[PDB]
RNA sequence: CAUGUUGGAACAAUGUAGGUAAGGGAAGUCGGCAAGCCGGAUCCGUAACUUCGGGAUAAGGAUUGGCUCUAAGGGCUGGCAG
RNA sequence: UACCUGGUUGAUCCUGCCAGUAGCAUAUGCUUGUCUCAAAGAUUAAGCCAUGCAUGUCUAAGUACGCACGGCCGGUACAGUGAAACUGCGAAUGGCUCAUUAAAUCAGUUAUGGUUCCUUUGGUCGCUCGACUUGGAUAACUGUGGUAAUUCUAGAGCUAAUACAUGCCGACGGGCGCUGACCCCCUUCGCGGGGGGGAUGCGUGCAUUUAUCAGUGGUGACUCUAGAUAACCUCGGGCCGAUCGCACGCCCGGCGGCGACGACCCAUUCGAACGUCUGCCCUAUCAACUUUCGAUGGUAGUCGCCGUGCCUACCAUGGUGACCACGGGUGACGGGGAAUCAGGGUUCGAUUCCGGAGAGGGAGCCUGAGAAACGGCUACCACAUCCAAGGAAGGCAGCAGGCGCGCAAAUU
RNA sequence: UAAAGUUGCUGCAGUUAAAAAGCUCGUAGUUGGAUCUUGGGAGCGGCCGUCCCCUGCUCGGCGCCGGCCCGAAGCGUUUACUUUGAAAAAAUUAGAGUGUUCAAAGCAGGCCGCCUGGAUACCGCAGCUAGGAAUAAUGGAAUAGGACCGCGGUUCUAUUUUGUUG
RNA sequence: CGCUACUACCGAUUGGAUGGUUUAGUGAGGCCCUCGGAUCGGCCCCGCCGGGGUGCCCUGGCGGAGCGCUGA
């Protein structure tokens, strides 16, 4: 079909090679996943050595690692913002490796409040009338508030992250190949990584 | 400095967003008893095809030549002169193979004519299969 | 070709099998196994060429399908099974065992041993592999993956397994003074003491070995197998004691028995 | 300005002035006459011959709408702002 | 054997070739008693092929209700033999040929720390803390058929598994993580302040995906192998045995020997691919070549089994060349080798051993560990076969043979 | 193919036989002056012949008692050259072994059950290896930005040591 | 200059035939993505109503549909 052959194209000198053999089967290429954000669709491709390769074609779920205190869930992938390869990979909302995507914040806001015992984002004056997340912040014993007391001094998150939670949309980097492995897994941008990619979102806007 | 490419330029091993209240820089010994230079350890550059601050393992042959072109970016052209014995005409003939060689930016102040040691590795590009392991300064050349 | 190969030509059969030119187009291409293609001796060749139990090819198959032949302590049905260096063929009925040892020349020695000796074979570890739960392994020269090893077994060392069970008993540390079987090159089967470990970062390390007469040589490290400590081997050695006297000494020593017989 | 010094009613032949024609395609004819094709711009590409200037828009191709963006090319006041 | 000799002249001495002279290997001529070895459709036509054969295969051990056969002790099915058929494997080897192909192939050298790998061989297969054996078809068979035609198949009625799938409990009582109700102490008048026990819930193997922390074992060097945590699990799915055979033992329904086959992973073996360094005949009446159709780098991916302009996006303006690049020719597969040979050379290598390519020409694929397979398929092109004119089938550069071409080559 | 020293590297010819560009310049290409390591001790056979000593800084033994004497290890201007070893498919070739009846061949066979065969050489170039250092290449310091030396100070530095604790 | 035989060369014919790579164009085909949906199912839930638990359930000969789910 399409091939990866190291004989069809030119020399260092610009001289052209004559073909000694016709396209070999081990010199194989296949059509790309071009994997979308929709309800999950992953096809199976049989590859060299009768092994199994998982073409993700539509993909909503994926694993996103929070950088600083290592909390990672099966999170929804809501948008594609930036792709350093091609700006046409962004518009046609395609997940590839080193994509700058948007995900759900609330699976990691749920971990923060369970662990750090403080409201994260939340425009101040807003109250929860069911009152279940306020149970997940307060209502502890004597000596185990001390376990939280010494955790409140390692609590102050990056202020660039906090606004993503306040909007409810975390900027994340795809660190897996969804077309090859069959997962849109990755990690959450923090610090100078985010402060870079946020400028390339302003650079696009005008 | 860095980060005038589209993607975020970093080393893929060291993590640089860890909680607190100079970056931690990845470097390995290249092997074969070659010194890892100061600028590869102290420096602020970042290159995946650098054998000091990157994932490229030097294996097989170690060759040497003279630097002839430095117009490709983060890679150069060396020139390797040798003599070929013909057994009929019991004489030699001056030949050369000018192979494309990856010049790590740790080897900063290189000039053309400098003698350069190369180490065989996995193919970096179409024609580049060799990283620079040390740049010795050319014959004379105080300046 | 475009995959594996079933046939081996007689003209490409390796040097030491001593397979002749005029009788057959093909050789016995060995079954895949613990030993390499060129570095083994097939059971078929050993049973009919090296011993003459059989004449034809059928008669070799008519022996090992009664399940008599037992290579390194387990019965193998496969006329073309690769029997390599240190491998013991315990043919149970004749009262004969056969440890395959490199002779002073390139050939595998037709070497009868006692069952008291046959109980173990000697094995060179190739790499120290650590498994999935901090559980180390030892890959021998003949594929015997033995786990929970002694941590003082490096990866040039030779060990002593037990044929009845298959577990480490004794080991030789790779040191100068220990004996050596040279398993490669032009010195294939010279038995001397190791007296130089010459290192090269990147390329192959060469090892200088000295025979009991003081006939010194060298071999790259990948082709040396230690069989003792001092000048005392753990196995039974073939006659001549792997000395490798020169052509002009062989000439007289052939004639010294030829003339002494009458 | 009031259709070029008149109107009305028809819609025949023959004209005069415009068109279009299935399939073939110059077989028509003194002769491709008349008609038809081609046609603007942009991007490739361009032969013989040559007085080296030309031939040349040779020949031969590709493209062209609408919409919606992106980038590039400047004045002016105190390597950057307004 | 380090060799010469005849020929220009009236005669001479030269330059110089023509011609002798022996080997070799093709063809041809005339001849030929014995016997031993032994080339052989390479050269032109990688031209065309009548026909036959050339890859099929069952063990004690996946399946056996075809009386096709058969023994006798049943009513606790199966004796056993065994076509067909399902299944598993092989069909990617071998053979043939030399058309391509001039840093290509190939040879020596190395690298795979950049990857795959059926089988074999050795590991692994209560590591995970949640049924004395399950489900519904299909083949052979019976039965009815359509067709001028094929290794074409349909419809109908049953029947099997190591075919197709769903899935169990034992192991197994707890252990290790974070949780936490609550539970005894001490310290200061109470706060404050220091150590413990611990119900419950949540998660817990290896394989796979990402990220983080830490520095058993191995290396010249790892982003190696382990380790700890956080999660992930593809419904077009990793494993975590529903499998068969023997002799069958032991004992107030439990256990057990020897196999066989399968399987995630790990090594190994046969490999395979991609690279490294050096090396090739003739040509300048081929001096510049390559580049918005990838040329040479950079970055990020896509993709591949992996390394890579392998392919895209976006930059950079490079890259080879008189030490002959690029182009063109080859009556060019490459080397091991062969002939000749004082010493140097020159010439040949189609050809049995290795590596490569190719199956009329290209192209595209299925299946599988492995094929861009041709004694596989789907096209198109060239050619050609059977025919009731509707269709259908094909690939000798396998072995014989036959035609064609030739100076040139064997038995269906 | 040798003959052909009529392709000439070995090894031809160019005044008149075939042939030196009309002449000079000139970048590739080829080739390039002399020049830097000598001599002494010492062991030694029959005045002469032969071997050996004239770099440099942690692990352990033969100790000797903070210091020395000797090995195992890393490094040491390079390159060409030479020598050495490794590694180098068989078959062919050279050739060792042996009455295929001899022979080309074959890898057989040989003794009264046993013995021993089925060596070795060669493999140009390139890469590996360790000697050699003449010859030929090249490099140091000439604005001393120089080697040899401890000084004085500078920035991050992580362990022997301030009992468990900070 | 003339006769003959032979060999190449020039030569109108926008000469002819074989390869080779190739701009542009049409384009079989497999493969891939995406729609599609011919048919074939196993169910839910119900019918004439059988055999047991106490008008409710538990299993079988057989009958439609809302073709209501679900799979290939």
Swiss-Prot record, chain B:
The keyword Ribonucleoprotein applies. GO terms for biological process: translation. The modification Omega-N-methylarginine is found at residue 59. GO terms for molecular function: rRNA binding; structural constituent of ribosome. The modification Phosphoserine is found at residues 57, 100. Pfam families: Ribosomal_S17, Ribosomal_S17_N. PROSITE patterns: RIBOSOMAL_S17. It is found in: Cytoplasm; Nucleus, Nucleolus. Citrullinated by PADI4. InterPro entries: NA-bd_OB-fold (IPR012340), Ribosomal_uS17 (IPR000266), Ribosomal_uS17_arc/euk (IPR028333), Ribosomal_uS17_CS (IPR019979), Ribosomal_uS17_N (IPR032440). Its main location: cytoplasm. Keywords: Acetylation, Citrullination, Cytoplasm, Lipoprotein, Methylation, Nucleus, Palmitate, Phosphoprotein, Ribonucleoprotein, Ribosomal protein, RNA-binding, rRNA-binding. The modification Citrulline is found at residue 20. The modification N6-acetyllysine is found at residues 28, 35, 48. A lipid is attached at residue 50 (S-palmitoyl cysteine). GO terms for cellular component: cytosolic ribosome; cytosolic small ribosomal subunit; nucleolus. Component of the small ribosomal subunit. Part of the small subunit (SSU) processome, composed of more than 70 proteins and the RNA chaperone small nucleolar RNA (snoRNA) U3. Component of the small ribosomal subunit. The ribosome is a large ribonucleoprotein complex responsible for the synthesis of proteins in the cell. Part of the small subunit (SSU) processome, first precursor of the small eukaryotic ribosomal subunit. During the assembly of the SSU processome in the nucleolus, many ribosome biogenesis factors, an RNA chaperone and ribosomal proteins associate with the nascent pre-rRNA and work in concert to generate RNA folding, modifications, rearrangements and cleavage as well as targeted degradation of pre-ribosomal RNA by the RNA exosome. Belongs to the universal ribosomal protein uS17 family. This is Small ribosomal subunit protein uS17. The gene is RPS11.
Swiss-Prot record, chain C:
It holds the Pfam family RS4NT. InterPro entries: KOW (IPR005824), Rib_uL2_dom2 (IPR014722), Ribosomal_eS4 (IPR000876), Ribosomal_eS4_C (IPR032277), Ribosomal_eS4_central_region (IPR013845), Ribosomal_eS4_central_sf (IPR038237), Ribosomal_eS4_KOW (IPR041982), Ribosomal_eS4_N (IPR013843). Coiled coil: none annotated. Signal peptide: none annotated. The modification N6-acetyllysine is found at residue 232. CDD domains: KOW_RPS4, S4. GO terms for biological process: translation. Keywords: Acetylation, Cytoplasm, Isopeptide bond, Nucleus, Ribonucleoprotein, Ribosomal protein, RNA-binding, rRNA-binding, Ubl conjugation. Gene3D superfamilies: 2.30.30.30, 2.40.50.740, RNA-binding S4 domain. The keyword Lipoprotein does not apply. Its main location: cytoplasm. Transmembrane segments: none annotated. SMART domains: S4. There is a cross-link at residue 229 (Glycyl lysine isopeptide (Lys-Gly) (interchain with G-Cter in SUMO2)). PANTHER family: 30S/40S RIBOSOMAL PROTEIN S4, SMALL RIBOSOMAL SUBUNIT PROTEIN ES4. HAMAP family: Ribosomal_eS4. Component of the small ribosomal subunit. Part of the small subunit (SSU) processome, composed of more than 70 proteins and the RNA chaperone small nucleolar RNA (snoRNA) U3. Identified in a IGF2BP1-dependent mRNP granule complex containing untranslated mRNAs. Belongs to the eukaryotic ribosomal protein eS4 family. This is Small ribosomal subunit protein eS4. It comes from Oryctolagus cuniculus (Rabbit). The lineage of its organism: Eukaryota, Metazoa, Chordata, Craniata, Vertebrata.
